[PDB]
Amino acid sequence: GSPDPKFNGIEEVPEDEIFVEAGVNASGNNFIEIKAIVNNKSGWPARVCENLSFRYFINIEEIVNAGKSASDLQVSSSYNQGAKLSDVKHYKDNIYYVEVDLSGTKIYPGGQSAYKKEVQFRISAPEGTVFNPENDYSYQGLSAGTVVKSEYIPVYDAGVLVFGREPLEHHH
Amino acid sequence: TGAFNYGEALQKAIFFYECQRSGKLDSSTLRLNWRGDSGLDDGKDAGIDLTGGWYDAGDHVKFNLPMSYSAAMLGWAVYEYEDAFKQSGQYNHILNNIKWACDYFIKCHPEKDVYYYQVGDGHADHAWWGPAEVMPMERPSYKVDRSSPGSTVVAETSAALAIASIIFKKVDGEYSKECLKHAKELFEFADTTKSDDGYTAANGFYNSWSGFYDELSWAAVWLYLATNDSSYLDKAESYSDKWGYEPQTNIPKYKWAQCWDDVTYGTYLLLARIKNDNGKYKEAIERHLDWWTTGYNGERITYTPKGLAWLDQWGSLRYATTTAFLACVYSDWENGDKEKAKTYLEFARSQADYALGSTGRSFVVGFGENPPKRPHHRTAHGSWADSQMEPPEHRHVLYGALVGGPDSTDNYTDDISNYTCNEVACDYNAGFVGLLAKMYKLYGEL
Ligand SMILES: [Ca+2]
Ligand SMILES: [Ca+2]
Ligand SMILES: [Cl-]
Ligand SMILES: [Cl-]
Ligand SMILES: [Cl-]
């Protein structure tokens, strides 16, 4: 006889290797501020990632209906070493997003400070303008004072989607 | 018979070497999905490409002495039992892995009398706990040369490449010739320097304890078998008075095992078959294998109650399974003592079966009943947090790894930080692969 030739070490990947955890860091009538922690717990195989980015999607319907536009939103942060934050960018319809780009920073499963990087960013409308997070795609399932893994904050590796989903309606 | 699936164990014990690969990998042909590119800057401090080779154990140092010893022993298995490898479907697998190490030894030999013998700093390497692909620390390379030589590691490398030249002759004649050229040059370098003064970066890990005369004779006898140039046979025999005697005697030493430091015992056996003159090499191998089995002149190695021949607390299974391979090879020598061959072969079977499960549990990761699941191995564990305890279970199965094994009364614990028990290593698996090939031939082929 001879051993089963199907034998291999191609294992089931039992867990999501690269993902963002997020939560509400602060909020007010006209803004939301997100705490986001990008994780690389890769194992199949482990790898170093130095071109990761993620996108946080909002719906500006309530801004437009107030007679304002995306140009009235302001992205800010006092906590973003190693992360570039975009201005709001148009996706489709009244869906916009903030890109958070950690390219140039090595994130890898090699220690407590290596496998995860925290970013904080705030999106504000003008004083007196209602900012409604409840209709924002990437706000779904977020809470104050805690971070949780979210499939609604998709992660990209050199601009290629590797985890989560973009807001495809109603269209996929 | 037999009592265990030796063919499966052999398959897995060879696969273990794929888990140890350093360098650029081809993910489209790998038999696993949890190893990636690693050590890609190996050699850059020296201005030379030293990528590839095998990580030694559960760490990421490339230690060329055990690495070349292990490739030599795998190669010796293919040389003796080629058909067993073909019938079990493991022949291309074993050659692919042996070539992984030998391609590296060639890179390590950029000029006739220059040889790189290590990549990685042992202390720095062991100070961090995570997978190979994300190593954060610098990995220095080290070389020996005519001014600062390393006869031990250069001669063991010569031997591995000489063996590679034989087993690749038919499948890749051009590579075969390349291995032989390097093997001859390395042997001349080791033989004409006779010094380990330059071999220093492995201090505390793989010191040369027995000296380099065993390696010089081992490399020379393999070069004789590779070339049929009788000058190499003369050369191997010329150091017989230098290998070592039992303390206080002129009796060729016998109370140890074939291992990464000491290849005297396999040299006895190879020379005994070549000379076939009922002479001193026959006597020397028989003294050795008698001590390990029935006893020699009233003395016998320690055995555990459950039947393991137990040489030392470190790598107990490694020493017993490697000696069992020598016993297999002896048993197949037509001119050997037939009654001793019977005894030696039954010993080899018993030691194989102890490793595979005769005590009620397997000592081979990913094989048999209740195998070890926490081998001391960074990449199989897969910590993202520089900790042996996070996660508390290994992320990957290190199939085929033979662990250190039990103490002298069969006690063993499956714990990632228990070193005598759960160390794994290239040299632990090397003789074991040859033993498994013979067991598969005996029991698994019909
Ligand atoms: Ca909104
Ligand atoms: Ca030696
Ligand atoms: Cl196979
Ligand atoms: Cl055979
Ligand atoms: Cl030394």
Numbering used by the authors:
A (entry chain B): 447 to 618
B (entry chain A): 1 to 446
Quote from the publication.
The C-terminal CBM3b module, as a classic CBM3, is responsible for targeting the Cel9I enzyme to the planar surface of the crystalline cellulose substrate.
The effect of the re-association of the CBM3c with linker (CBM3cL) and the CBM3c without linker (CBM3cNL) on the enzymatic activity of GH9 has been studied by the crystallization and structure determination of the reassembled GH9-CBM3cL complex at a resolution of 1.68 Å. Surprisingly, the combined modules crystallized and formed a structure similar to those of the known GH9 cellulases. The catalytic module of the Cel9I enzyme consists of residues 1–446, comprising 15 α-helices, whereby the twelve longest ones form the (α/α)6-barrel. One calcium ion is found near the catalytic cleft of the GH9 module of Cel9I and is coordinated by a Ser 210 (OG) 2.6 Å, Gly 211 (O) 2.4 Å, Asp 261 (O) 2.4 Å, Asp 214 bifurcated (OD1, OD2) 2.5 Å, and Glu 215 bifurcated (OD1, OD2) 2.5 Å. One calcium ion was found in the upper β-sheet of the CBM3c molecule and is coordinated by a water molecule and five residues from the upper β-sheet: Asn 500 (O), Glu 503 bifurcated (OE1, OE2), Asn 573 (O), Asn 576 (OD1), Asp 577 (OD1).
